[PDB]
Point group: C2
Chain length 164, copies 2
């Protein structure tokens, strides 16, 4: 019972958790419907040094998941994006523990700031990440397009440095 770095040995578990973990909003349904198993196997490998999926485990079962994508681009390594937060049953006690692990890892890679883009009408998520310490950075009209239907996103930022 704890959190480790997922890897290409977890591809199986990771589709199952995707099949119902975030199967909430139509975004979550479309992702499933049209995303490649290649990019996944890519991300899940350790040659993708900066593209990391973390998982929370209850016994054999993957229970939560989240990707850390650090920007390996000139002058941008101090930053990273959190993406594809899939949770089973919507157990928040567990996800909160997961996000925290991911923060500790970030610090330990010297990642200075974390960002997440959240769909303007996923209020549960805004409340969750906000409660973790993320704050408003930007607001993006038509950040995401599905079929020919658009979605706005709120960009949040968390800093992993004792700033203040």
């Amino acid at each position: 019972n704890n959190i480790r770095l997922l890897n290409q040995n977890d591809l199986d578990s990771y589709i199952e958790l995707m099949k119902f973990g975030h199967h909430n909003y139509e975004w979550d349904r479309y992702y499933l419907e049209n995303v490649s198993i290649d990019r996944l196997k890519t991300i899940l490998s350790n040659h993708t040094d900066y593209w990391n999926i973390f998982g929370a485990f209850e016994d054999d079962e993957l229970v939560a998941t989240c990707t850390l994508k650090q920007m390996n681009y000139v002058g941008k390594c101090h930053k990273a994006i959190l993406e594809n937060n899939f949770v089973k049953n919507n157990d928040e006690i567990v996800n909160r523990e997961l996000i925290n692990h991911i923060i500790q890892y970030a610090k330990e890679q010297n990642i200075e700031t974390l960002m997440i883009a959240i769909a303007s009408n996923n209020i549960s998520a805004k409340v969750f990440f906000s409660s973790i310490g993320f704050e408003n950075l930007a607001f993006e009209k038509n950040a995401s397009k599905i079929g020919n239907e658009y979605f706005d996103e709120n960009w949040l930022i968390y800093s992993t440095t004792e700033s203040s």
Copy 2:
């Protein structure tokens, strides 16, 4: 005069020469050159990354300006793209203006509806210029970039080809 086209692996020398002029007003050309790897340059230039394309302007056979278009090949994000590494010999505005037009027309052909570019925060020439092609400020990014232990604030500008 001019000619504008896709850059390939064969234009790498030229492109390296362009950066070396040091004409970028906030030194991005030196920063980028000091810190980038040729493998990644080669990866950008390559046929095999068709959502990631560098355009160049030529005077004769001389590479006189450059700007890269990076489309978002993430699942719901394909309608967007970033302009990056806009390097311009002499900061020649008439040249750079033909270049962006061409890239915009090319974006339109890919069904790209929105383009974004990061500009140094205090760069008001660039804000004026992009502003005159139709880009407006989307957000301010404090500590957008770090090199060594130097930070840089940027603003993201955005344009709708819609």
